[PDB]
Amino acid sequence: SVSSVPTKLEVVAATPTSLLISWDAPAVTVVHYVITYGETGGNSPVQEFTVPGSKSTATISGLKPGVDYTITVYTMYYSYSDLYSYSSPISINYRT
């Protein structure tokens, strides 16, 4: 009925070794967002961390200059039917 996936995931600001990302919250009670990031085309462990449900931006630090990263965001959310479950991800690529 209602999507629990965030929309308009984008890099709003960048340095050679960090990215500020933002997204629009979905119309459900999000308890927290899970941000994942890793070097595109594999060959590097994907890392993840959470941000609280109220926040809709996040900083990713400690990246390497001139490298393509795959960045994804999903929610851990409350709905009536499923109680707590995890949304599908929304995903972008970005080269530092």
């Binding site: 119309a27 109220s54 009536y80």
Partner: protein
């Protein structure tokens, strides 16, 4: 056993209504899901009117009032669903709507109980 059928018939009707209304309307306003609110306001109203009505009709079969109160109102209303909605809001750091949801459910349900009771007593 006759009493058990009252609870089951009433309860199943109430639970079914709560399911339909909640799956229909809860996603419309996630900070205070209105399906869950409406079923509690509605049961508050019904049991308020039952309170007033059954006082004035002392000889009414215990089967019917068991079906309406423990059954219908008991099945229709819910505390566990409020508890989990509020818990989620609390985990989400949304304290304002956690508190508001508790207050609107409690005060709202009591107002509806009062309104049902007093409409029927002011009607007699």
């Amino acid at each position: 056993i006759k009493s058990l059928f009252a609870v089951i018939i009433g309860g199943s009707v109430g639970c079914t209504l709560r399911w339909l209304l909640s799956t229909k309307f809860n996603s419309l306003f996630p900070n205070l899901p209105p399906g869950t609110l409406v079923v509690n306001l509605l049961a508050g109203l019904i049991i308020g009117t039952a309170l007033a009505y059954f006082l004035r009709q002392p000889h009414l079969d215990p089967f019917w009032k068991l079906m309406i109160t423990t059954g219908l109102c008991g099945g229709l209303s819910t505390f566990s669903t409020i508890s989990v909605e509020v818990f989620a809001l609390l985990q989400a750091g949304n304290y304002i709507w956690a508190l508001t949801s508790v207050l609107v459910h409690v005060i709202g349900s009591l107002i509806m109980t009062a309104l049902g009771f007093f409409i029927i007593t002011i009607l007699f």
